[PDB]
Amino acid sequence: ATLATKKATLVAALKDLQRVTVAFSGGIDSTLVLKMALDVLGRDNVTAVVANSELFTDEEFDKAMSLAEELGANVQGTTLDYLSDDHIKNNTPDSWYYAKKMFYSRLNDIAANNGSAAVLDGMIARSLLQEADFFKTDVRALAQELGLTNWNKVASCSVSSRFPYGTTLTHDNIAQVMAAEKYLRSLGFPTVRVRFHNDIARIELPEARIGDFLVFNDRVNRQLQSLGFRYVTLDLGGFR
Amino acid sequence: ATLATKKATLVAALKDLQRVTVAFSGGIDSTLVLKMALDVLGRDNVTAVVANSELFTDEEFDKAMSLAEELGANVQGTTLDYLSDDHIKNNTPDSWYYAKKMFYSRLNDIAANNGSAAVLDGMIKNEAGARSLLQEADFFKTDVRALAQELGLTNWNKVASCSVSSRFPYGTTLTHDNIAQVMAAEKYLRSLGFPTVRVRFHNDIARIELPEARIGDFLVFNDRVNRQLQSLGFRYVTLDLGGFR
Amino acid sequence: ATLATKKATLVAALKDLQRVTVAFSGGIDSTLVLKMALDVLGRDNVTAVVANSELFTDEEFDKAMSLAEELGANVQGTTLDYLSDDHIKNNTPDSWYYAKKMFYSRLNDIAANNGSAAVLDGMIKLKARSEAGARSLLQEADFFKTDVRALAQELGLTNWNKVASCSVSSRFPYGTTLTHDNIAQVMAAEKYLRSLGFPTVRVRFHNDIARIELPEARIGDFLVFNDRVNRQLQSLGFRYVTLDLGGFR
Amino acid sequence: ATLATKKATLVAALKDLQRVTVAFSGGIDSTLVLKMALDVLGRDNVTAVVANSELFTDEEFDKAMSLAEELGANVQGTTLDYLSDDHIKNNTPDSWYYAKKMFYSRLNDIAANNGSAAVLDGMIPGLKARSEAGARSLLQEADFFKTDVRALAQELGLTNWNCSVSSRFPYGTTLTHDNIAQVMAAEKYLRSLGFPTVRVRFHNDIARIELPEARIGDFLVFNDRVNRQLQSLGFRYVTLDLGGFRSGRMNDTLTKAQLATFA
């Protein structure tokens, strides 16, 4: 339960696997797994996969593709068509599960195609970090120990959560929500939700940021209206 | 011309009518007409009528009844059935016409039965069955304030009142339940110190409009307002970033 | 009875007294009494009296003095030494009765020396009042607050002190002994806070702690003043300067 | 002494003059002199003059004109060209004096041409502007304080009544028709947002906005609109003075003194 002991448990696991395919999102967790896998197995035994999809931002895709190459890995993008599944398209309350099936099936296929022994992710499918009992504390210490300083500081969540259960997702309403959230982040609010209620936009901010938001009220109102919302509102209860 | 000329115009018009019924809302315009009617014709020749209805608050009705009494008038409450008309209940842009028709129809019946020569309302500069003497005498808001002060009037409702129908989208059917929900929500917001407020009804969403200069003061109340309006039946309680109108 | 009858009752009562001393606070009730006394008896036969004391602000005193003069009354200030009464100094629930008793006793002395037939106050539809023989003509004529407002409108009165102020003793817990120093400390603190744009404020005294009560809707506006209020009230002697998260009262 | 004694002094002075021209600003003081002149001398023997100029708002002028009309006085508007005087155009510290000189010179010309025996005003670098012009301040000669003005106005039944734009420019800055218009439009816009007490001080390409400090937190919701509106009026930079309107007046005693020392 020392860090040196957990790092060794991780090393021993990667060595036994020989070849791996890493589901790589660009956060600090998957960043740590990919770097360790490269160090222990070498570039030509590691394949980093970054999923491109409608449910997540193109900025997160382009950032993870760039970061994985930056760590010295063979990186491959793959495009998932989440809305082709009827459960996801109609935002069923179990649609999270159908999306994971699509995801891991694709990476399972890529991994069997390239001869990998397992698909790896960054939980703290094999979650080696979790298996070695890494906490966020340990992930921070080891990443700094390897010289890592660059990763996506905001981990994102599926845009489906912005729509009520049963609401049909469309390319247009997803783009409208993602454009609104991107604008709000560019103003200094990295944690924000633009909940979609047809003609009404309902913005969720952490309550301690709401006073800071006041200077932007008018600009946000006009911008989100130009994106197609008729009414632009701020939820009084805050984020969650 | 001058305020004295406009007031003299108003006096001559009242003397010519001799006996009037005054539609009294409690605002400054309606307070000025009622007081001038009383000052020129006397209590026995003026009837003050305050309309009670589902579209306006009980608070505003109670305030108007006491102020009319305070002014020296013999006052009469009357209750209107706006929702009994299908045009008003279904909330179209034509609801206004049917509301005015019912209002003036009720006032004319009162006026017919007490022998008044006209129904007077408080419309100012900027209905065929009523006389708007301030408008005929070319009173602007500024002349109303000046003559009110000269007469020593100080007690009126200072916040403009508006039919609760404006809180529901056109084509939405008004119900006793959703009206009460909006009324209770706005009453709570006024009790916190926001006399000018709208709770716009969007089914499970409340969209609160405040004057933008007040939005910064509202932050200390977010959580209490959120919880209170949820207990009134809204699922989501929101602040419109554009502010009041 | 009609408002015209109540006014007539008040006129006849004033005519019968012929010369009066009016306890004037600046509120709408004493303004109406003072204005009716002037209209019926003439400025030469009415004296308006405003009490100054340690328990109320100088600003309320000066405003009442100006309002009486603007109404056309000869006005006289008188200063009461409320802290000389131990019932008041010890801040008990009956302190206000002894304050009232000292007030009306001073008014009787003034009235005796100027030939007034009665002391009038602004009470509407009280033991210290009756013990001193002072007269509440609005109460005797059946004026309620709506009648007061109706007659004030008819007389064209539009200016009066809208906030009936409150004795500074409410800033100290019952049983806490009032002193010249702790009163002055609280009074100066509230005076500074009003000067910043907060007319409704309390500085509650908790020895080395000042606990400021503001209307909650004003608390956000206060932020720009935190450090100045902190240092200003510490220089008045408080060790800690705090804002009550619950707001006013 | 006595209000009655003071009112009588003012009455005797008016009777002795018989016909007067009154400088009328619409404030309570000039409202009182105008009403007393009318009551003692009659409408035919009083001329009220309201001055229009570039240094005050059209709103203020119209207000004064209608109030003089409301009191029942024959009223004459006259427009002054204050910027024709180099002290005013260059906004020197004695600019007020030369403005008064030009104002009283115009009133004297009106008074000479209508047969008035004096110019009256509402008062309570050389000779006094009035003394030089021969203007009379009857409320001052009768020792009226402001409470006396207020007392007599209620007694006479007066119930309705109402700063030069040059104060928005630094001394030595040249006033122009354009930059005056720019300052006045900026303040009118800020007042329309709900800030009745406001100054837009002109520092060439910078606007420096003074607000009462208790309003500054509420103002934040308007920052971007104010910035873009005042830039379209010609300012390059739009700023908020952190000291607020009448800086120092709300500071604690120690820092109030420090701000005095810095000035």
Next chain:
Amino acid sequence: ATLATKKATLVAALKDLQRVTVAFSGGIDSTLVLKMALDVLGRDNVTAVVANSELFTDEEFDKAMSLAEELGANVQGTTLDYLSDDHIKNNTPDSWYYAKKMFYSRLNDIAANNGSAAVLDGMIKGARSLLQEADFFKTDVRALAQELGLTNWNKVASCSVSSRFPYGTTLTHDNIAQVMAAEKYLRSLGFPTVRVRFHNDIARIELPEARIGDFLVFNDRVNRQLQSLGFRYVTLDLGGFRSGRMNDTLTKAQLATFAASW
């Protein structure tokens, strides 16, 4: 001179001591001493000691225990009974020193029994403060911690709960629990640096001034929550946490006069 020379002084001091016991609080200073001790002497010749007591939170103890383990140290918990000392129990102005004396007495007992040559603490510019002997200032501590790859330490300074009570007030489990629960609630709202000062029926909350404007949306919830914990009045100190450090020159001088008057 240079950081390298200061680090070299610290290395030489550790090698001469050979075996040491480290008073480990989890702050950045203690973290550096512990890490350097491990690198110079090895895991078998260093014992990290984390004190648990009623005057500090369980969260700070758990954080310190995990960080010492993560750095690779044999770590040992030890529990101090500060409240059995009358100066500490009655919170006299010298309470800090009787607490420190009891603390170092415990560390000496442990060090004597494990064969350590000294007790080390994290003090900077019979216990040894090697950072101070090597002329480390705060900026040198941060520079060397960064060079050593140290990332996890207590970003918010820990501090004994005694500082929340006036001198002469008797500490009890009830009023300590009341203060700790109030501060934990405020931390859960997003204010990691906070003090709830105890004044019998008054709670006086200190926040960094740059956070006070953000607190407004929580006023009513904080008021209710702290009243249910037993306070009658819940107040915000207008001077904030660490009053005066962010003031202009003049009023920083004034606030220091005020603070000195008590």
Next chain:
Amino acid sequence: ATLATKKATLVAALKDLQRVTVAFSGGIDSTLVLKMALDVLGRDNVTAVVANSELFTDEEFDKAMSLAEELGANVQGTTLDYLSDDHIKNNTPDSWYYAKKMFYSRLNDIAANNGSAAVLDGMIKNKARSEAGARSLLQEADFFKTDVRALAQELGLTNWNKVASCSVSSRFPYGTTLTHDNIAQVMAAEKYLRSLGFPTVRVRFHNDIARIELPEARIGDFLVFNDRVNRQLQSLGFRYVTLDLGGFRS
């Protein structure tokens, strides 16, 4: 096209120079050059030079010196008198070039006097330099920002100036004359605001007016400090202290 080939080009370039003087700012780029120069040529053959001047803060000078020392380099400060150049003192739009010219001219003098074959800076793929003959080895080896980060990670570099500063000349309008006093005044004002918790700030100088630029999302936080900032910046010599309603870089 790979990181390994770019690093090799940079190594071979350094080996061919043998001896160098490194313009060291403390940012990640010049940190990478200084670390690669030390690793390839040895401490005795590298001189890190940090410029002290009126256009940058003393604190930034001190940080760069300590960062170079931490890397294990011989470092020397050099003091430039930028205000002696009339283009810089009168703050024309061309002042940024004359400052760079004076900088690279000084470094060439140091390089000539210590036997260096070149002056190196940290410019990457993303005018005064070329005219002075200074070499940007990261630019010549095709390093983009991501390549700089990749190699710093590989070398174990994790410490550098994360915020690159701007010459204080940017706080003055073109045509405004720089003086020792107004520069100091601007610097002390920005230092005070940073101490309040506003790391990104500019105090723009408009003679008797200070115009403070903050990120708009911080302006609400700022309110509690209005009066202290007003009085502090007045004690530094400004008559009026203002907040730009347009925010940072309005």
